[PDB]
Amino acid sequence: NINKLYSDIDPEMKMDWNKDVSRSLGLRSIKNSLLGIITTRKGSRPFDPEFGCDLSDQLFENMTPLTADTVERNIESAVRNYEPRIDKLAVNVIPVYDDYTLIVEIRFSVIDNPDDIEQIKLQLAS
Amino acid sequence: NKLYSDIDPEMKMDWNKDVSRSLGLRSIKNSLLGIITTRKGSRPFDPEFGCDLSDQLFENMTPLTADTVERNIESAVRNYEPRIDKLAVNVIPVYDDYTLIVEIRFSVIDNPDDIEQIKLQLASS
What we know:
2 copies of one chain form a homodimer.
Chain A: H1 19-39, H2 57-61, H3 67-82, E1 86-96, E2 101-110, E3 118-124
Antiparallel strand pairs in A: 1-2, 2-3
Subcellular location (chain A): Virion
Function (chain A): Baseplate protein that is located next to the tail tube (inner baseplate). Involved in sheath assembly. The gp25-(gp6)2-gp7 module is involved in sheath contraction.
Protein name (chain A): Baseplate wedge protein gp25
């Protein structure tokens, strides 16, 4: 019926088959959370008018060498406010003037594994 | 005047933990809304992200739609919000509007006793 498993004595032979699954699920949910934070217009969500980022169309139509830094601070504060699972955080915005776009490069670490640097890279328009 | 209660480990208090828990709950509810209102397959970096809530789903609404949507939402939440412990999704159809009442009761991993909830209306595009 069943071949019995000798688990009466089992110290260092302990296995955890959920480590990589729960860690990689955590990372996936964090990246999707980041995308939702960045792509939601701040003030558009009535249950939380503070949620999201301020990325108006004038910010893309009138691009200056300060746009990158202001968008960097905006995104950084939004992520600190709405994704507490991120430990180390660094946002770099590249203004692509010829097509009026912004490259958002987010390098971060997860609270559980603050050593590994994960990264996402998006391109925003209007 | 001496308030040395923090000296004993049993009498140790941190009055900022409830604040951090509140901020975490707000971020969880916002993540939930993101998951519920994103069409599954529409996100290129993760085609598994979101829910199956289509114009066909809202237009061809039957008394089985509720259970279908409850299961779909439960699966999306289990797959994309691991901070949620206990989870119950109750969907009530509004046929004359082609809309859905979605109630989500859940607990947070850090303290699984307290039951939180959101309640939202969903419609087609």
